[PDB]
Enzyme design. Structure first.
Site, PDB file in Angstrom:
ATOM      1  N   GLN A   1      -3.623 -12.451  10.361  1.00 54.25           N
ATOM      2  CA  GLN A   1      -4.165 -11.417   9.283  1.00 54.25           C
ATOM      3  C   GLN A   1      -3.342 -11.942   8.038  1.00 54.25           C
ATOM      4  OE1 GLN A   1      -5.043  -7.316  10.449  1.00 54.25           O
ATOM      5  NE2 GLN A   1      -3.982  -8.051  12.287  1.00 54.25           N
TER       6      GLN A   1
ATOM      7  N   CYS B   1     -13.331 -31.445  -5.347  1.00 54.29           N
ATOM      8  CA  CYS B   1     -13.153 -32.043  -4.176  1.00 54.29           C
ATOM      9  C   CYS B   1     -13.241 -33.751  -4.494  1.00 54.29           C
ATOM     10  CB  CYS B   1     -14.451 -31.777  -3.346  1.00 54.29           C
ATOM     11  SG  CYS B   1     -14.384 -32.225  -1.805  1.00 54.29           S
TER      12      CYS B   1
ATOM     13  N   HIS C   1      -7.819 -13.825   7.015  1.00 56.27           N
ATOM     14  CA  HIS C   1      -7.903 -13.165   5.770  1.00 56.27           C
ATOM     15  C   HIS C   1      -7.517 -14.324   4.827  1.00 56.27           C
ATOM     16  CE1 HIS C   1      -6.662  -8.980   7.969  1.00 56.27           C
ATOM     17  NE2 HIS C   1      -8.019  -9.575   8.213  1.00 56.27           N
TER      18      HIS C   1
ATOM     19  N   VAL D   1      10.811  -7.844  15.041  1.00 56.30           N
ATOM     20  CA  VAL D   1      10.042  -9.155  15.840  1.00 56.30           C
ATOM     21  C   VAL D   1      11.001 -10.199  15.983  1.00 56.30           C
ATOM     22  CG1 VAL D   1       8.882  -9.875  13.686  1.00 56.30           C
ATOM     23  CG2 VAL D   1       8.248 -10.560  15.759  1.00 56.30           C
TER      24      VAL D   1
ATOM     25  N   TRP E   1       0.932  -1.236   0.014  1.00 59.12           N
ATOM     26  CA  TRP E   1      -0.013   0.175  -0.077  1.00 59.12           C
ATOM     27  C   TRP E   1       0.860   1.449   0.126  1.00 59.12           C
ATOM     28  CZ3 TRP E   1      -2.676  -3.158  -1.960  1.00 59.12           C
ATOM     29  CH2 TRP E   1      -3.482  -3.941  -1.344  1.00 59.12           C
TER      30      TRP E   1
ATOM     31  N   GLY F   1       4.119  -7.492  14.444  1.00 57.24           N
ATOM     32  CA  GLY F   1       4.154  -6.957  13.023  1.00 57.24           C
ATOM     33  C   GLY F   1       2.720  -6.588  12.497  1.00 57.24           C
TER      34      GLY F   1
HETATM   35  N1  LIG Z   1      10.630  -6.745  11.047  1.00 50.91           N
HETATM   36  C1  LIG Z   1       9.553  -6.287  11.706  1.00 50.91           C
HETATM   37  N2  LIG Z   1       9.628  -6.324  13.063  1.00 50.91           N
HETATM   38  C2  LIG Z   1       8.608  -5.666  13.494  1.00 50.91           C
HETATM   39  N3  LIG Z   1       7.769  -4.783  13.035  1.00 50.91           N
HETATM   40  C3  LIG Z   1       7.881  -4.699  11.531  1.00 50.91           C
HETATM   41  C4  LIG Z   1       8.536  -5.779  10.996  1.00 50.91           C
HETATM   42  N4  LIG Z   1       8.437  -5.294   9.785  1.00 50.91           N
HETATM   43  C5  LIG Z   1       7.519  -4.956   9.487  1.00 50.91           C
HETATM   44  N5  LIG Z   1       6.896  -4.503  10.653  1.00 50.91           N
HETATM   45  C6  LIG Z   1       5.645  -3.726  11.051  1.00 50.91           C
HETATM   46  O1  LIG Z   1       4.475  -4.579  10.531  1.00 50.91           O
HETATM   47  C7  LIG Z   1       3.390  -3.833  10.494  1.00 50.91           C
HETATM   48  C8  LIG Z   1       2.498  -4.472   9.538  1.00 50.91           C
HETATM   49  O2  LIG Z   1       1.383  -3.686   9.436  1.00 50.91           O
HETATM   50  P1  LIG Z   1       0.554  -3.830   8.229  1.00 50.91           P
HETATM   51  O3  LIG Z   1       1.821  -3.625   6.944  1.00 50.91           O
HETATM   52  O4  LIG Z   1      -0.494  -2.896   8.035  1.00 50.91           O
HETATM   53  O5  LIG Z   1       0.144  -5.250   8.123  1.00 50.91           O
HETATM   54  P2  LIG Z   1      -1.144  -5.996   8.646  1.00 50.91           P
HETATM   55  O6  LIG Z   1      -1.066  -7.324   8.759  1.00 50.91           O
HETATM   56  O7  LIG Z   1      -1.434  -5.307  10.109  1.00 50.91           O
HETATM   57  O8  LIG Z   1      -2.110  -5.649   7.410  1.00 50.91           O
HETATM   58  C9  LIG Z   1      -3.503  -5.843   7.776  1.00 50.91           C
HETATM   59  C10 LIG Z   1      -4.119  -6.253   6.628  1.00 50.91           C
HETATM   60  O9  LIG Z   1      -4.287  -5.006   5.568  1.00 50.91           O
HETATM   61  C11 LIG Z   1      -4.174  -5.650   4.283  1.00 50.91           C
HETATM   62  O10 LIG Z   1      -5.341  -4.840   3.542  1.00 50.91           O
HETATM   63  C12 LIG Z   1      -4.220  -7.057   4.381  1.00 50.91           C
HETATM   64  O11 LIG Z   1      -5.559  -7.430   4.340  1.00 50.91           O
HETATM   65  C13 LIG Z   1      -3.608  -7.393   5.665  1.00 50.91           C
HETATM   66  O12 LIG Z   1      -4.044  -8.638   6.107  1.00 50.91           O
HETATM   67  C14 LIG Z   1       3.853  -2.335  10.177  1.00 50.91           C
HETATM   68  O13 LIG Z   1       3.176  -1.242  11.067  1.00 50.91           O
HETATM   69  C15 LIG Z   1       5.293  -2.606  10.273  1.00 50.91           C
HETATM   70  O14 LIG Z   1       5.882  -1.357  10.823  1.00 50.91           O
HETATM   71 ZN   LIG Z   2     -16.392 -31.352  -0.859  1.00 43.85          ZN
END
Ligand SMILES: Nc1ncnc2c1ncn2[C@@H]1O[C@H](COP(=O)(O)OP(=O)(O)OC[C@H]2O[C@H](O)[C@H](O)[C@@H]2O)[C@@H](O)[C@H]1O
Ligand SMILES: [Zn+2]
Ligand SMILES: NC(=O)c1cccnc1
Length: 282
Positions: A104, A157, A124, A242, A62, A198
């Site tokens: 997610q 299936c 998701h 992480v 995004w 994350g």
């Molecule tokens: N190595 C790391 N260590 C810590 N944090 C991290 C690292 N790398 C990235 N981040 C953080 O990890 C965070 C990831 O935030 P987002 O990217 O919004 O992911 P979501 O899973 O919440 O997205 C939700 C849904 O949105 C979509 O539409 C889909 O449908 C998704 O499933 C960030 O704030 C980074 O700073």
């Molecule tokens: Zn079936």
């Protein structure tokens, strides 16, 4: 799709200075030791160190789209390896310190890491997973199922049914799987500790599940490099990678991070493996 709200993208990263990072990972260990029921929520940030870009990071899918640029993948979904963090979550379930895992992420990696599906909510969906429309039987495949948006994959299936198989990859309009969400919701409300890793927690209702733990005196730890929707509500926020946090945490808990034998599906959680005795806290 074009209209869809993709939230706050590309917020600046926070790095806790090491002295402070060390102290917060010890306090996280303290909370893991006192908690009856620990639930982990994971988002895209736990798979960035396997080459999968996140969504709202500095180089998020995004964020890059917003700046007229392209996310960059350093792996395919099929050639991606579960991170130290994924394999740390396998062990914490194996030794009885993880009650449930809410994700997610569609990247397949918690499933492929050998994490038991009966303790995993894939809110998701999963790229490698296709579901029979008729009998609701789910198939974990060794390649990505070619479609997204709950479409027919073109396979049928094979239950002793010929039902249309479909992807589990929700489009913007699609409600979450009632089973995964019901089970994620229960685990969250009952949890006395919810740890986020994350995720920016910007998506309803996934992002709100950790807040459910705060009812009836539960603790919330948010582990994220960026700010998150619910930072204010956290008993602890840790601004660091992480993998560094989970490797330090495991060390504090006296658990090794187990080997990844390669892609393996576990349907059902086993009886808890032995774990170290707990330290004296007070
Ligand atoms: N190595 C790391 N260590 C810590 N944090 C991290 C690292 N790398 C990235 N981040 C953080 O990890 C965070 C990831 O935030 P987002 O990217 O919004 O992911 P979501 O899973 O919440 O997205 C939700 C849904 O949105 C979509 O539409 C889909 O449908 C998704 O499933 C960030 O704030 C980074 O700073
Ligand atoms: Zn079936
Ligand atoms: N890790 C993920 O599930 C994912 C999938 C697609 C794009 N970005 C992240």
């Amino acid at each position: 799709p074009f209209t869809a709200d993709k939230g706050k993208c590309g917020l600046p990263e926070i790095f806790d200075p090491p002295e402070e990072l060390e102290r917060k990972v010890w306090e996280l260990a303290r909370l893991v030791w006192q908690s009856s029921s620990v639930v982990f929520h994971t988002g895209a940030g736990i798979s960035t160190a396997s080459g999968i870009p996140d969504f709202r990071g500095p180089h998020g899918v995004w964020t890059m789209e917003e700046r007229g640029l392209a996310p960059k993948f350093d792996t395919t979904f099929e050639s991606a390896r579960p991170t130290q963090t994924h394999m740390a979550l396998v062990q914490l379930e194996r030794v009885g310190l993880l009650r449930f895992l809410v994700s997610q992420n569609v990247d397949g990696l918690h499933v492929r890491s050998g994490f038991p599906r009966d303790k995993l909510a894939e809110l998701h969906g999963n790229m490698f997973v296709e579901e029979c429309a008729k009998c609701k039987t789910q198939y974990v495949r060794d390649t990505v199922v070619g479609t997204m948006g709950l479409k027919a994959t073109g396979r049928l299936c094979t239950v002793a049914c010929r039902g249309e198989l479909r992807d589990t990859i929700l489009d913007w309009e699609d409600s979450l799987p009632d089973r995964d969400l019901a089970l994620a919701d229960e685990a969250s409300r009952n949890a006395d500790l919810s740890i986020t890793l994350g995720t920016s927690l910007q998506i309803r209702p996934s992002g709100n599940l950790p807040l459910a733990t705060k009812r009836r005196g539960g603790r919330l730890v948010i582990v994220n490099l960026q700010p998150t929707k619910h930072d204010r509500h956290a008993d602890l926020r840790i601004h660091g990678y992480v993998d560094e946090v989970m490797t330090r945490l495991m060390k504090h808990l006296g658990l090794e991070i187990p080997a990844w034998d390669g892609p393996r599906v576990l349907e059902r959680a086993l009886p808890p493996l032995p774990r170290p005795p707990t330290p004296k806290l007070e």
